[PDB]
């Protein structure tokens, strides 16, 4: 916990809920991870297929629309973009499925 | 050049341009990057000041508010975030100073 956030890897022993908060629907609260995820982390089983989208450093700072923001909560830089899946991949069906499983789906449990 | 643009790797020998477009102010564009940085990719002088802003591929997933659209050009990953600087750091003002140095810097290239 000693990590900046950005930096931080979650685990079973340090989860998504305490590496990155609750899953929720505000603004800046991140929306991703079904019950498994949150409590596991990278130790998620089909982790590698989800990591397959996560960017590079560069990538990051390639792809992104990079901004920033002075609020009294602090100095903050701002990120969006979006990442193309390969529908030619014959994985394809599979990883939309994967990533949907994950996005939201903290609406149906406490 | 075959890799997922998510996964590229700008150095001097496959630059930003090469890997992720020409700067621009279109939501699809990235936005972030002088001359220098743009030719030089990691290998820019002040490429680890930079990266430690760059997420995980666990706090990518973790932190940011993650979704799905299908557009005619294909089905997209979809991430916004933003990351808070810590004031507490001695490198803080030469951090907003890097930060400004680069974002939206092609507005003045010749």
Do not use: C
Not at 20 to 48: A, M
């Amino acid at each position: 916990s000693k990590k900046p956030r950005q930096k931080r890897t979650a685990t079973k022993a340090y989860n998504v809920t305490q590496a990155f908060g609750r899953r929720g629907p505000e603004q800046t609260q991140g929306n991703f991870g079904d019950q498994e995820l949150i409590r596991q982390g990278t130790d998620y089983k089909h982790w590698p297929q989800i990591a397959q989208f996560a960017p590079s450093a560069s990538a990051f700072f390639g792809m992104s629309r990079i901004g920033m923001e002075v609020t009294p909560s602090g100095t903050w830089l701002t990120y969006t973009g979006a990442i193309k899946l390969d529908d030619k991949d014959p994985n394809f069906k599979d990883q939309v499925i994967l990533l949907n499983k994950h996005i939201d789906a903290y609406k149906t449990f406490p």
